[PDB]
Structure formats: C-alpha cells, structure tokens
Amino acid sequence: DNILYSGETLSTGEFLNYGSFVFIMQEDCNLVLYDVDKPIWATNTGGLSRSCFLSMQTDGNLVVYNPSNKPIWASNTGGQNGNYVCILQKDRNVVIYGTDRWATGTHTG
Amino acid sequence: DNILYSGETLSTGEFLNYGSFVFIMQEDCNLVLYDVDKPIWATNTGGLSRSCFLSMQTDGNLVVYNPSNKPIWASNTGGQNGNYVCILQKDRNVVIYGTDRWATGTHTG
Amino acid sequence: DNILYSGETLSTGEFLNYGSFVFIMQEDCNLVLYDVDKPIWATNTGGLSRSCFLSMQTDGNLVVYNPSNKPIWASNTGGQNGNYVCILQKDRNVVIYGTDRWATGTHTG
Amino acid sequence: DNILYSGETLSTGEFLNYGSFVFIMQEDCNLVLYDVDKPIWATNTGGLSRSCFLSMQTDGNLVVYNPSNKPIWASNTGGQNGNYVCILQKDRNVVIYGTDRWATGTHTG
Ligand SMILES: CO[C@H]1O[C@H](CO)[C@@H](O)[C@H](O)[C@@H]1O
Ligand SMILES: CO[C@H]1O[C@H](CO)[C@@H](O)[C@H](O)[C@@H]1O
Ligand SMILES: CO[C@H]1O[C@H](CO)[C@@H](O)[C@H](O)[C@@H]1O
Ligand SMILES: CO[C@H]1O[C@H](CO)[C@@H](O)[C@H](O)[C@@H]1O
Ligand SMILES: CO[C@H]1O[C@H](CO)[C@@H](O)[C@H](O)[C@@H]1O
Ligand SMILES: CO[C@H]1O[C@H](CO)[C@@H](O)[C@H](O)[C@@H]1O
Ligand SMILES: CO[C@H]1O[C@H](CO)[C@@H](O)[C@H](O)[C@@H]1O
Ligand SMILES: CO[C@H]1O[C@H](CO)[C@@H](O)[C@H](O)[C@@H]1O
Ligand SMILES: CO[C@H]1O[C@H](CO)[C@@H](O)[C@H](O)[C@@H]1O
Numbered sequence: 337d338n339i340l341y342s343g344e345t346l347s348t349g350e351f352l353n354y355g356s357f358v359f360i361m362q363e364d365c366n367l368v369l370y371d372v373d374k375p376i377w378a379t380n381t382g383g384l385s386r387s388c389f390l391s392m393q394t395d396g397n398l399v400v401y402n403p404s405n406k407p408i409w410a411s412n413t414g415g416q417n418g419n420y421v422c423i424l425q426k427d428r429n430v431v432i433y434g435t436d437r438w439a440t441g442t443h444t445g
Numbered sequence: 446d447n448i449l450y451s452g453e454t455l456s457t458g459e460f461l462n463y464g465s466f467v468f469i470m471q472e473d474c475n476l477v478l479y480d481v482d483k484p485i486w487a488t489n490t491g492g493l494s495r496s497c498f499l500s501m502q503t504d505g506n507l508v509v510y511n512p513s514n515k516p517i518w519a520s521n522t523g524g525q526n527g528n529y530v531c532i533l534q535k536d537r538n539v540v541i542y543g544t545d546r547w548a549t550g551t552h553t554g
Numbered sequence: 555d556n557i558l559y560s561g562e563t564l565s566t567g568e569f570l571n572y573g574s575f576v577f578i579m580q581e582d583c584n585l586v587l588y589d590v591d592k593p594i595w596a597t598n599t600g601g602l603s604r605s606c607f608l609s610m611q612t613d614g615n616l617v618v619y620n621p622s623n624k625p626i627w628a629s630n631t632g633g634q635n636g637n638y639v640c641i642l643q644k645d646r647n648v649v650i651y652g653t654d655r656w657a658t659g660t661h662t663g
Numbered sequence: 664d665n666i667l668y669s670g671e672t673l674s675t676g677e678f679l680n681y682g683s684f685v686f687i688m689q690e691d692c693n694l695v696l697y698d699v700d701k702p703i704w705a706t707n708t709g710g711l712s713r714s715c716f717l718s719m720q721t722d723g724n725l726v727v728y729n730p731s732n733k734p735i736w737a738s739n740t741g742g743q744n745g746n747y748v749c750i751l752q753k754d755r756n757v758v759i760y761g762t763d764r765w766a767t768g769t770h771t772g
C-alpha cells in the first residue's frame with residue numbers, strides 16, 4: 337500500500353510502495369525512499385539501532401522508534417490529536433496530511 | 446487509484462477504487478459509493494443534470510459540477526487554501542484530509 | 555488482486571478486482587463478473603447451493619464447489635498438470651492462461 | 664502494472680511492479696529484476712546498446728530489442744502464435760504463461 341494511516345506502524349522490513357517508489361523502514365533503522373535502486377531521501381539514522389519501526393501517530397507526528405520505544409527520528413509535526421495519513425504519492429513526494437475534514441461515514445469494522 | 450489530489454478532477458464515468466469499493470462520478474450526476482453492486486452512499490443528485498465532473502479543490506472543497514460549471518453538490522468544507530487529498534480508504538470510508546503538514550520534498554516533474 | 559493462481563481458491567464473498575471490475579464468488583453460489591453495479595457475466599448457478607468456493611486447479615480447470623464438495627460449475631478446461639493463472643484483465647476479460655513457458659526462477663515465499 | 668500482455672512493449676525506463684519488486688527495462692539495455700535496491704536477476708546485456716525495448720510477442724517469445732530492431736536477448740520460448748502474459752508474481756517470480764485456455768469473452772476495446 338502507499339498509505340500509512342494514523343494509528344498504524346511499519347515494522348522493520350515493511351514499506352510503502354507506488355510504481356518504482358519504495359519507502360521502507362529498514363532493519364538497520366534507516367528510513368529510506370528508493371526510486372528503483374536509487375536512494376532519493378533518508379533519515380540517515382542507519383546504524384543507530386536494529387529492528388526499528390515507523391509510527392504514524394494520532395497527534396500527527398511521524399516517528400521512527402527503536403525496540404525500547406525511543407524516538408530515533410521524528411517529523412516534529414505532533415500536536416492536534418486526530419486522523420492523519422502519510423502518503424507515498426504518485427509524484428514521488430511523501431506527504432503527511434490531516435486532520436480529516438469530511439467523510440462519507442461508511443467505514444466498516 | 447484510491448486517491449484524488451487537490452487540483453484533480455474525476456470526469457463522468459471515472460472513479461476511485463479499492464478492492465470491491467468504487468467511488469464513481471456517474472453520467473446521471475449522482476456521486477455514488479458502491480460495495481460490489483450495492484450502493485452504500487450517494488449525493489442523491491442523480492437526474493439533476495448530465496455529464497457532471499467531481500473536483501477536489503485547493504480550498505478543501507469537494508464539488509460536483511455540471512458541464513456549465515454550476516455546482517450541483519458540495520461537501521462544504523471550503524477553507525484554508527492548500528493541498529488536500531480525497532481518499533477511498535481500505536475501511537470503506539471516503540475521507541478528505543488536509544492540509545499537508547510535512548513532506549520529504551522528493552517530488553519530480 | 556486480479557490474479558488467481560493454480561493451487562489457490564476464492565472462498566465465499568472473496569473476489570478478484572481490477573478498476574471497476576469485480577469477479578466475486580457470491581454466497582448464493584453465483585460466480586459473477588461486475589462492472590460497477592452491472593452484472594456483465596455469471597455462471598448462473600445462483601441459488602443452487604450456499605457458501606460455495608472457487609478453485610483454480612493445477613490441471614487448468616476452474617471449478618465451483620458447494621459445501622458438500624460437489625462441483626456445481628466448471629470451465630471444463632482440465633488437462634495437463636502444471637502452473638496456470640486466472641486473470642481479471644484490464645480489458646475486462648477473465649482468461650485462464652497456462653501452462654508456464656518460462657520463468658526467471660527468482661521465487662521466494 | 665504487474666502484467667505484460669502479448670503484443671505489448673516496455674520502452675526504456677518502463678517497468679512491471681509489485682510491492683518492492685521492480686522488473687525494469689533500463690536505459691543501458693539491461694533488463695533487471697530488483698527487490699528494493701537489490702538486483703535479483705538480470706539479462707546481463709548492460710552496455711550492449713542504449714534505449715532498448717522489451718517485447719512480449721504473440722509467438723510466446725519475450726525479446727529485448729535495440730533501437731535498430733536487432734534482438735539482444737530473448738527467453739527463446741517462441742512457438743505457437745496466441746495470447747500470452749508475462750507476470751511479475753507475488754512470489755517474486757517472473758513467469759510467461761500461455762496460451763489462453765478459457766475466457767468469459769467479456770472484453771471491450
Ligand atoms: C549509508 O547507507 C545507509 O543509507 C543508505 C542511503 O539511505 C541506504 O541505502 C543504506 O541501506 C544504509 O541504510
Ligand atoms: C512527546 O514528544 C513527541 O515526539 C516524540 C518523538 O519525537 C514522541 O515519542 C511523542 O509521542 C510525541 O509525539
Ligand atoms: C472516526 O474514524 C473514521 O472516520 C474518520 C473520518 O471521519 C477517518 O479519518 C478514519 O480513518 C475512520 O475511517
Ligand atoms: C435512484 O438511483 C440513483 O441512485 C442510486 C443510488 O442512490 C444509483 O446507484 C443509481 O445509479 C442512480 O444514480
Ligand atoms: C460557495 O463557494 C464554494 O462552494 C462552491 C459551490 O458549493 C464552489 O464552486 C466554490 O469553488 C467554493 O468552494
Ligand atoms: C509542491 O507540492 C508538492 O508538495 C506538497 C507538500 O509540500 C504536496 O502536498 C503536493 O501534492 C506536491 O507533492
Ligand atoms: C438473478 O440474480 C442472480 O444473478 C445476478 C446476475 O445475473 C446477480 O447479480 C445476483 O447476485 C444473483 O446471484
Ligand atoms: C471430472 O474431472 C474434472 O472435472 C471436475 C469438474 O466437473 C473437477 O471436479 C475435477 O477435479 C476435474 O478437474
Ligand atoms: C515452481 O513454481 C514456481 O514457478 C512456476 C514457473 O516455473 C510458477 O508458475 C509458479 O507460480 C511459481 O513461481
């Protein structure tokens with residue numbers, strides 16, 4: 337999927353994808369955006385831990401946590417509690433949007 | 446695709462899709478959400494005109510226009526000018542999120 | 555997914571999807587191909603049983619089984635044992651292809 | 664997309680994709696299968712030309728052509744003229760299947 341909803345996480349090795357774009361939460365704790373085999377953007381935190389996870393929070397903050405639950409990296413966009421989405425777009429941009437402004441209200445459970 | 450970006454338009458017959466979920470801008474001008482063949486939600490504007498288009502605007506408003514550019518239906522969520530997305534989620538909810546809070550800034554043209 | 559591989563089955567209510575096309579193994583045992591809410595093709599086995607499952611076999615035969623395990627519909631294309639695929643194509647055609655003629659051999663699990 | 668239909672061509676820089684898998688016809692004439700940034704398989708024709716194209720033929724042959732239309736690589740599976748598909752599978756295998764054994768005959772265009 338190319339969307340990471342608030343309240344969800346990407347475990348080590350999991351990623352967002354779109355066309356030839358891959359945004360993966362690597363094993364070495366480096367969160368990289370690849371265009372095929374070319375690294376376009378990264379948090380540059382590789383080697384700072386092992387088996388990190390990416391968290392899209394309900395406060396709007398995108399945080400990379402180590403297994404001890406320590407913030408290795410963050411987008412620093414925390415604040416208003418609500419519904420946010422982190423999207424790996426078709427234009428290669430990875431953007432955080434929120435909060436929800438309108439909804440049909442047809443969600444399931 | 447399941448995302449409609451601000452500045453984009455869905456022409457009559459065009460839709461957003463996810464699994465068995467289809468959010469379509471019908472030729473009768475009724476914007477409907479179907480679960481397989483079952484209509485789950487609609488604007489109930491069918492028959493009000495012909496060949497409408499759905500537009501996700503930069504003001505945050507999702508508007509159904511007819512060929513003459515007369516608004517047939519609107520989410521009425523206009524406001525801050527910016528970047529918004531309209532998503533047909535995996536939970537079957539259609540939500541508008543915005544504006545953008547953060548971005549890797551790795552887009553290409 | 556738009557592909558059903560040999561050795562795989564679609565349980566009741568499960569489907570193959572592509573754009574607005576939905577190929578679903580319904581609870582009433584009718585196997586229908588939908589284009590939005592319009593029934594484009596069906597096995598016409600609706601009501602013959604309940605809770606059927608669709609099986610794409612390793613002999614190339616696509617069979618619909620009822621809970622008692624008796625076939626109620628089949629493509630009748632059983633033949634050479636091997637690898638086959640049932641695809642819901644972008645042109646709206648549902649085709650069975652096989653067997654495999656070549657492969658990179660880069661498979662994993 | 665993850666499927667290349669017989670009669671279709673992938674120009675240089677064009678690819679098949681699925682998850683973190685990318686099957687790309689590069690500009691250097693090398694046809695590589697990547698798992699994220701790691702090359703899992705290649706035709707090894709890099710540097711033999713420029714701006715090559717990949718063709719899934721109706722005779723079942725998957726061929727890499729140069730700008731002058733000279734074959735630079737092929738699966739060597741040319742045979743009976745029919746309908747074939749080259750699929751980048753979910754198991755990470757790239758396989759050619761054919762010919763078509765059955766169809767619903769619900770295609771357009
Ligand atoms: C310096 O290497 C690290 O950073 C690059 C660029 O992000 C990644 O590709 C690689 O896997 C490592 O995590
Ligand atoms: C309290 O600080 C904020 O940012 C850190 C990481 O930067 C998170 O652990 C925390 O949940 C908040 O969102
Ligand atoms: C209450 O949660 C649900 O609805 C909101 C919008 O109202 C979405 O943001 C969220 O993903 C769920 O679908
Ligand atoms: C009354 O019918 C209208 O509305 C239903 C759902 O409300 C749509 O499925 C249909 O195509 C029409 O536009
Ligand atoms: C009242 O103005 C707003 O709503 C109308 C129709 O509802 C849109 O056409 C317009 O662009 C604004 O968003
Ligand atoms: C310049 O616009 C780009 O960046 C913003 C975030 O800054 C995105 O919302 C938008 O869709 C584009 O990718
Ligand atoms: C006659 O009703 C049956 O067949 C139609 C299509 O022919 C399906 O849409 C429906 O679900 C039933 O199974
Ligand atoms: C009769 O042999 C084949 O046909 C029936 C369908 O009628 C299948 O159940 C069986 O497994 C074989 O594929
Ligand atoms: C052995 O199975 C694998 O290889 C064949 C082709 O060799 C494919 O059809 C199948 O899906 C698997 O990837």
Ligand SMILES: CO[C@H]1O[C@H](CO)[C@@H](O)[C@H](O)[C@@H]1O
Pocket residue numbers: 373689691693695702704705709
């Ligand atoms: C060895 O270099 C060549 O082959 C590898 C994979 O084998 C490609 O990644 C690369 O772009 C070159 O074409």
Ligand SMILES: CO[C@H]1O[C@H](CO)[C@@H](O)[C@H](O)[C@@H]1O
Pocket residue numbers: 720722724726734736737741
């Ligand atoms: C022997 O010919 C076959 O293979 C070559 C490449 O080797 C293709 O150009 C041709 O169309 C056939 O498929």
Ligand SMILES: CO[C@H]1O[C@H](CO)[C@@H](O)[C@H](O)[C@@H]1O
Pocket residue numbers: 643645647649668746747763765766770
């Ligand atoms: C006329 O061709 C169509 O039908 C065949 C099966 O008959 C498919 O293989 C092909 O892709 C098209 O959908």
